[PDB]
DNA sequence: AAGTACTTGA
RNA sequence: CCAGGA
DNA sequence: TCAAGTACTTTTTCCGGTC
């Protein structure tokens, strides 16, 4: 989604349709502000989420002693130095796929041999 | 636990909401 | 074709069970009459589109020679179906007076979805004759046929009198079948009426229990 | 328990499993989206461009409800885009205009439009859709497992012989309804909830 | 290779009563739980005074 | 336990007591057996009154 | 257990005074989107502010304890993933020596 | 019998109602527990017959 | 230490997983109803949405959590300034405490003295208590978005053991305050040195003998078995 | 027996690998859940089953 | 911890 | 109540 | 009128001390 606020109010924006020119706007319900929409998408639900998997990957991730290490060669820098964890999306369903974070290039690679990622 | 109470805690209890129109100063334990 | 044929199967399955219940109650219905196939049901009670014509289905039934021996005052029965999913005071007043004029003893009304509280108020309006309401959906499956459902047999006034005499009982002391009980409904039991349940026993092979109506 | 004949037929078991195990529009949906697509004939989403080009050839709201279904999920609980779409169409009747991407097509999509003030209206329609629209199955009946129970039965020769059968195991109860289902033995059907047995089969 | 700390002695996970149980690593879990209840009722010199 | 790495689904991590009583238990085996052992003592304790009232 | 002890309860101020002096931006002046990766610092469930390089702060605080300057019964934890640093001067906490 | 102050009457009445109430049952919904001068509540007659330990 | 206001703040996510209009309201000490989070921030001084949202969600990217805040913004849309927010809080009593000047003055006191009493009970600390409430809403939503696990109510790290010292502390405080109000009684009587030292002694004496940790021969609910006779069967015992 | 103890140790040893094998299989997302079960639920069932098969 | 019985808002 | 026993 | 909330009810085997 990614929504905007009113400059002047800082209050949130409500969508208004410009019936005449068939176009979407964003009105402020505290002042007389109006701005045209960036995207046609107003609301996104998302039931089968993937946002949470690689959360809290601070560059300090290597400083956690609790995290386990592996000798897996990186897809980028080919470094056999990396820390690993499972999908941080705390759901029942969730697969046991592993996320490896490079102790040099910091690139996040997975063990998923069914699908190919970029997060 | 008891030592921390006598030495400190006990004094603090003696003077927190204590003072009445009469104040309570330093505590002594025999 | 679609999912039309399935509502037919269900109405036919329901009809078989109605016929089953009627024969069971103690009325003259044949086995070939019950065992009527689906194809034969279609080519009888379906219009010029194969849509079920429930008005045609409605039928009269008479007590078996055997039934008048046990229950002499057991009169004729009328079983009416309805093509209107919601049955109202208009269609009900028709059926109600029909039973009073044809001097019927009992009358069953098989309805698709509902019977308005307006129409339901005409149910106990014409005694000594009695009216019963059966939701078509319940009857799709004959519960009596189930593994766990044993033979219930309705006792006569004399048979009851004898039971109580033989066991030195007050009606209080007998185990009770609830008036609304699926089987008490299937048999059209009235308050005071007694059933004789014959169950199989891992103990004795055959065990006879009795239940009085609520 | 299955119908007398089709007792060893695993494919018959699956058929009933499918006909009884409850399925909602929610269980198949990846995500729902609300877009402002003002031309009913032409779409701002270039993906969908092809779906319109057909579900038009061989008046309505400019606000679009677009939901993506999961192919993997649409399969385990056997379903077609056609049959899913049909349920929505048959739920909202002539007050919702539905189009859907083909079972073949890469992404699985259902485009919906209504017949001043419409934003909140569609958010209600999507809640009705996910929570109230029943696709397959019977209510209260979830997780249906297939089971190969062993049954002792007399053989033609007389002796009692092991003749195992396919049996279904529910995660919920609805006696009245599952009994009236074609393909089962309504004479054999059992529930651990005796309160139900009492209510349906007598005391 | 990440080790931040080391255990002084693993036997220290035990309380006063369980610490008199000889080879508690060779007993079934509750038999140990039983002894750390019975020894409290065992006679002996409680204090020299 | 703090003696293990995160996301360890190994038998040794999730309570598999590899050893015989004759051989002896490792501290980890000992504590896990203790957790499992405590569960039975809890039901023995509870069941006792629940079971009593059922009887009544 | 034999080596278990229970925290007597110390004073939080020497630590709050120490923190501010060691790169701790006070909550009163926090601007979430400016410093968005900021490690949030708590002392007895009281959010005092944020810190930009916790790595170095955590090491300083640990050296402070291991020296005696920060009392040894004081608990300090750094959950890297959650971006949090919670400190406990608090009484009643059960501890063991390692 | 005397100069009825009419409110001091409905007052003295409601107190008697309470005593004759709390005598038979002291463990009533509307909380005042007719506590003996010792904090300890007064033992009602109902309490005496109430299950396991006590009469029946 | 100091009175110990056992006021527990609940931040409630109304609506279930699959219900429309999932609002966030919070039950404030001495206020009958649960106030929609927004009004609380407004009563605190954080007036425009987005300034409010900044305190809750820390990542401007995270659309998922932000959509979840839109209903709250709609719920608090009625109240637009700090004053009208305090009145709305003041309206919902208490009892009600009828009078416009009275209710707005109340809400001030509740937010200062009963709302989040740790942190500070002082005046000018709205900024601190706002960011905290926002940290709480962040955690409420983080769990509802299935990113964090529900809190383990049985984690030993989240438990404390009150030994002899804190136990005595609780009881001594109770009695010294009872002495303070007996000091006030003899000062009121003196319309112009009679401080009963018995209350402190006999009080501690009662508690430690009976093990009924409270005041005094009129104990219940008091916690019996706090103080007990030392087992001297064997040394280990 | 000395060799029975070698034979026992090597029974656990092979079951320990069988478990790692299902773990590696699950981490590589190749595991296919049993109808009416989590991918994880299905895995734990297998692990638990091998380890018991082993103890016995 | 799980009920009956009664009361309250849509 | 408190502590214990099968 | 009918779901959902409210009050208020109810139990838990047998056998010294210190008060
Ligand atoms: Zn504005
Ligand atoms: Zn790399």
- Domain D10-144, what fold? Gyrase A; domain 2 (3.30.1360)
Question: CB-based contacts of B14: which residues, under 8 Å, 6+ apart?
Answer: B24, B27, I176
Tokens of I179: 């002495």
Chains that touch H (3 or more CB pairs under 8 A): I
Q: Please, which positions of strand M sit below 7 A from a protein CB?
A: 7-14, 17-19
Q: What would the 3-class secondary structure string for A80-111 be?
A: CCEEEEECCCCCCCCCCCEEEEECCCCCEEEC
Q: Please say whether the beta carbons of C208 and C197 come within 8 A.
A: yes
Q: How many angstroms separate the CA atoms of C34 and I19, rounded?
A: 50
* Probe site for chain A from E2, E3, E4 (most A CB atoms < 10 A): E2
Question: CB-based contacts of C176: which residues, under 8 Å, 6+ apart?
Answer: C211, C212, C213, C214
Q: Where in chain A is the domain with CATH 2.20.25.10?
A: 1-45, 46-119
Q: What residues in E contact A61, CB-CB < 8 Å?
A: none
Interface of G with I in 43-72 (CB under 8 A): 44-47
| Domains of chain G and CATH, by start | 9-90 (3.90.1070.20)
Q: How many angstroms separate the CA atoms of C3 and C22, rounded?
A: 30
Q: Which helix or strand (DSSP H or E) is residue A3 part of?
A: none
What is the domain extent for residue I113?
Answer: 1-152
CATH assignment of A46-119, among 3.60.20.30, 3.40.640.10, 2.20.25.10, 2.60.120.10: 2.20.25.10
Q: How many angstroms separate the CA atoms of I147 and I108, rounded?
A: 36
Residue A89 at interface with chain I, using a CB cutoff of 8 Å = yes
Residue I221: is the preceding peptide bond cis (ω within 30°)? Answer: yes
CB contact under 8 Å between I54 and G93, yes or no, is no
Q: How many angstroms separate the CA atoms of C205 and C199, rounded?
A: 8
Residue E14 at interface with chain I, using a CB cutoff of 8 Å = no
Least CA distance to I148: which residue of chain G? Answer: G82
| Phi, then psi, of F45 in degrees rounded to 5 | -60, -55
Asked if residue I209 keeps its beta carbon closer than 7 A to nucleic acid strand M, the reply is yes
Residue C8 at interface with chain D, using a CB cutoff of 8 Å = no
Q: Please say whether the beta carbons of A100 and A82 come within 8 A.
A: yes
Q: Which helix or strand (DSSP H or E) is residue D34 part of?
A: strand D29-36
Tokens of I33: 């109803």
Interface of G with I in 18-37 (CB under 8 A): 27-28, 30-33, 36
Distance of I195 CA from M10 C1′ (whole Å): 49
Q: What is the DSSP string of I139-167?
A: HHHHHHTTSSPPP-TT-GGG-----HHHH
Q: Nearest nucleotide, C1' to the C-alpha of F52?
A: M13
Q: Is A45 annotated as a binding residue?
A: no
Least CA distance to C144: which residue of chain D? Answer: D201
Distance of J48 CA from M11 C1′ (whole Å): 38
Please tell me the distance in Å from F39's CA to the nearest CA on chain E.
10
Asked if residue I229 keeps its beta carbon closer than 7 A to nucleic acid strand M, the reply is yes
Q: In what order do the strands lie in the sheet with A13-18?
A: A13-18, A23-28, A34-36
Q: Which of G62, G65, G46 is nearest to G54 (CA)?
A: G62
Q: Which helix or strand (DSSP H or E) is residue G30 part of?
A: none
Residue C54: count other Cβ atoms within 10 Å of its Cβ: 19
Q: How many angstroms separate the CA atoms of G43 and D38, rounded?
A: 55
Quickly tell me which residue has 């009484």 as its tokens. Answer: G91
Tokens of I237: 């015992």
Tokens of C210: 């009795």
Q: Please say whether the beta carbons of F28 and F1 come within 8 A.
A: yes
Question: CB-based contacts of H52: which residues, under 8 Å, 6+ apart?
Answer: none
Residue G82 at interface with chain A, using a CB cutoff of 8 Å = yes
Closest residue (CA) to C1' of nucleotide M14 is F52
The technique is X-ray
Q: How many angstroms separate the CA atoms of A15 and A43, rounded?
A: 11
Q: What residues in A contact I77, CB-CB < 8 Å?
A: 29
Distance of G24 CA from M10 C1′ (whole Å): 57
Q: How many angstroms separate the CA atoms of D109 and D112, rounded?
A: 10
Pairing of strands C176-177, I10-13: unpaired
CATH assignment of A1-45, among 2.20.25.10, 3.20.20.70, 1.25.40.340, 3.40.50.920: 2.20.25.10
Q: Please say whether the beta carbons of F14 and F29 come within 8 A.
A: no
Tokens of C23: 């024969």
Least CA distance to B2: which residue of chain I? Answer: I165
Question: CB-based contacts of C44: which residues, under 8 Å, 6+ apart?
Answer: C56
Q: Which of G22, G18, G55, G61 is nearest to G37 (CA)?
A: G55
| Phi, then psi, of I188 in degrees rounded to 5 | -65, -40
Tokens of D195: 């309160």
Residue E16 at interface with chain G, using a CB cutoff of 8 Å = yes
**Exposed/middle/buried for residue J21 (C-beta within 10 Å: 0-12, 13-18, 19+):** exposed
CB contact under 8 Å between G98 and E19, yes or no, is no
Residue I145 at interface with chain A, using a CB cutoff of 8 Å = yes
Distances in whole angstroms, Cα of residue G50 to Cα of each of D55, G23, I34, I119, I140: 56, 8, 30, 15, 21
Q: How many angstroms separate the CA atoms of I214 and I234, rounded?
A: 31
Provide the CATH number for the domain around residue I75. Answer: 3.90.1110.10
- Contacts of residues B21-26 at CB distance under 8 Å and 24 or more positions apart, as own/partner, are B21/I187, B22/I183, B22/I187
Q: Is A83 annotated as a binding residue?
A: no
| Domains of chain C and CATH, by start | 1-141 (3.40.1340.10), 142-214 (3.90.940.20)
Residue B4: count other Cβ atoms within 10 Å of its Cβ: 19
């Amino acid at each position: 989604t990614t929504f905007r606020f009113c400059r002047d109010c800082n209050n949130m924006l409500y969508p208004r349709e410009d019936k005449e020119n068939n176009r979407l706007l964003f009105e402020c319900r505290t002042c007389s502000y109006v701005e045209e929409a960036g995207s046609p998408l107003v609301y996104r639900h998302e039931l089968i989420t993937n946002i949470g998997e690689t959360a809290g990957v601070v560059q300090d991730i290597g400083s956690d002693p609790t995290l386990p290490r592996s000798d897996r060669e990186c897809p980028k820098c080919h470094s056999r130095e990396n820390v690993f964890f499972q999908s941080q999306q705390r759901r029942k369903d969730t697969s046991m796929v592993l996320f490896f974070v490079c102790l040099s290039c910091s690139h996040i690679f997975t063990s998923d041999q069914k699908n190919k990622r970029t997060q | 636990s008891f030592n921390q109470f006598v030495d400190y805690t006990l004094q603090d209890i003696i003077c927190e909401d204590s003072t009445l129109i009469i104040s309570f100063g330093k505590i002594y334990v025999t | 074709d679609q999912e039309n044929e399935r509502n037919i199967s269900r109405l036919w399955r329901a009809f078989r069970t109605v016929k089953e219940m009627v024969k069971d109650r103690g009325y003259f219905i044949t086995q070939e009459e019950v065992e009527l196939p689906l194809e034969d049901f279609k080519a009888k009670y379906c219009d010029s589109m194969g849509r079920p014509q429930r008005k045609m289905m409605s039928f009269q039934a008479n007590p078996t020679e055997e039934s008048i021996s046990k229950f002499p005052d057991m009169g004729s029965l009328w079983v009416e179906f309805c093509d209107e999913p919601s049955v109202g005071v208009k269609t009900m007043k028709t059926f109600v007076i029909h039973i009073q004029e044809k001097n019927f003893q009992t009358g069953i009304f098989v309805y698709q979805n509902n019977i308005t509280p307006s129409a339901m108020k005409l149910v106990p309006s014409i005694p000594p004759a009695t009216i019963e309401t059966f939701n078509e959906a319940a009857l799709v499956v004959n519960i009596t046929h189930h593994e766990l459902v044993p033979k219930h047999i309705r006792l006569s006034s004399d048979e009851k009198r004898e039971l109580l005499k033989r066991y030195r009982l007050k009606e209080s002391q007998l185990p009770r079948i609830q008036r609304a009980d699926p089987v008490a409904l299937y048999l059209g039991l009235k308050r005071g009426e007694v059933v004789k349940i014959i169950r199989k026993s891992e103990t004795s092979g055959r065990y006879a229990s009795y239940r009085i109506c609520m | 328990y299955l119908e007398p004949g089709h007792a060893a037929d695993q494919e018959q078991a699956k058929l009933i499993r499918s006909a009884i195990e409850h399925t909602t529009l929610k269980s198949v949906t990846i995500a729902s989206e609300i877009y402002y697509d003002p031309d009913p004939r032409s779409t701002v989403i270039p993906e969908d461009e092809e779906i319109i080009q057909l579900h038009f050839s061989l008046q309505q709201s400019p606000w679009l409800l677009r939901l993506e279904l999961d192919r993997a999920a649409m399969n385990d609980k056997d379903l077609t885009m056609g049959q899913v779409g049909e349920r929505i169409k048959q739920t909202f009747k002539n007050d919702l205009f539905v189009i859907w991407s083909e079972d073949n097509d890469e992404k699985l999509i259902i485009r919906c439009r209504v017949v001043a003030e419409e934003d909140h209206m569609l958010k209600k329609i999507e809640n009705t859709m996910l929570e109230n629209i029943t696709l397959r199955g019977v209510e209260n009946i979830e997780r249906v497992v297939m089971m190969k129970y062993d049954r002792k039965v007399p053989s033609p020769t007389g002796e009692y012989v092991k003749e195992p059968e396919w049996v279904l195991e529910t995660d919920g109860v609805n006696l009245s309804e599952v009994m009236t289902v074609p393909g089962i033995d309504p004479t054999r059907i059992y529930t651990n909830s005796f309160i139900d047995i009492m209510e349906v089969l007598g005391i | 290779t990440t080790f931040t700390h080391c255990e002084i002695h693993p036997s220290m996970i035990l309380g006063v009563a369980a610490s008199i149980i000889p080879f508690p690593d060779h007993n079934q879990s509750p038999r140990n739980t039983y002894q750390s209840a019975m020894g409290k009722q065992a006679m002996g010199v409680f204090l020299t005074n | 336990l703090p003696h293990f790495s995160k996301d360890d689904y190994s038998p040794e991590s999730k309570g598999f007591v590899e050893n015989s009583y004759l051989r002896g238990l490792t501290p980890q085996e000992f504590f896990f057996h203790a957790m499992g052992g405590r569960e039975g003592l809890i039901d023995t304790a509870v069941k006792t009154a629940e079971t009593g009232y059922i009887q009544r | 257990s034999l080596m278990s002890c229970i925290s007597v309860g110390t004073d939080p101020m020497p630590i709050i005074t120490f923190l501010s002096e060691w790169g701790m931006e006070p909550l009163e002046d926090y601007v979430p989107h400016q410093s968005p990766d900021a490690t949030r610092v708590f002392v007895n469930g009281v959010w005092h502010g944020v810190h930009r390089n916790p790595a170095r702060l955590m090491e300083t605080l640990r050296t402070l304890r291991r020296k005696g300057d920060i009392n040894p019964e004081v608990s300090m934890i750094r959950d890297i993933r959650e971006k949090e640093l919670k400190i406990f001067t608090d009484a009643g906490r059960v501890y063991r020596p390692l | 019998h005397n100069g009825a102050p009419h409110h001091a009457i409905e007052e003295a009445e409601s107190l008697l109602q309470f005593h004759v109430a709390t005598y038979m049952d002291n463990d009533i919904a509307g909380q005042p527990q007719a506590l003996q001068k010792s904090g300890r509540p007064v033992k009602s007659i109902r309490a005496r017959l109430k299950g396991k330990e006590g009469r029946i | 230490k100091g009175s110990r206001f056992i006021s527990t703040l609940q931040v409630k996510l109304y609506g279930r997983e699959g219900s429309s209009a999932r609002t966030i309201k919070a039950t404030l000490p001495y206020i009958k109803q649960d106030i929609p989070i927004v009004i609380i921030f407004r009563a605190l001084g954080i007036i425009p949405d987005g300034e409010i949202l900044e305190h809750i969600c820390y990542d401007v990217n995270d659309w998922q959590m932000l959509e979840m805040l839109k209903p709250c913004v709609e719920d608090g849309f009625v109240i637009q300034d700090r004053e009208t927010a305090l009145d709305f809080i003041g309206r919902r009593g208490t009892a009600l405490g009828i009078k416009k000047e009275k209710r707005i003055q109340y809400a001030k006191d509740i937010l200062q003295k009963e709302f989040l009493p740790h942190i500070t009970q002082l005046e000018g600390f709205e900024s601190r208590k706002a960011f905290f409430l926002g940290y709480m809403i962040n955690r409420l939503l983080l769990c509802a978005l299935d990113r964090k696990d529900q809190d383990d109510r049985d984690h030993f790290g989240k438990k404390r053991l009150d030994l002899a010292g804190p136990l005595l502390a609780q009881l001594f405080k109770t009695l010294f305050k009872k002495l303070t109000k007996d000091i006030f009684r003899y000062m009121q009587r003196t319309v112009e040195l009679a401080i009963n030292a018995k209350t402190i002694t006999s009080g501690l004496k009662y508690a430690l003998a009976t093990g009924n940790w409270g005041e005094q021969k009129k104990a219940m609910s008091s916690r019996a078995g706090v103080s007990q006779v030392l087992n001297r069967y064997t040394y280990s015992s | 027996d000395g060799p029975t103890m070698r034979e026992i140790t090597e029974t656990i040893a092979e079951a320990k690998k069988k478990v790692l094998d299902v773990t590696k299989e699950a981490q590589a997302n190749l595991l296919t859940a049993k109808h009416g079960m989590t991918l994880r639920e299905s895995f734990e069932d297998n692990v638990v089953r091998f380890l018991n098969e082993a103890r016995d």
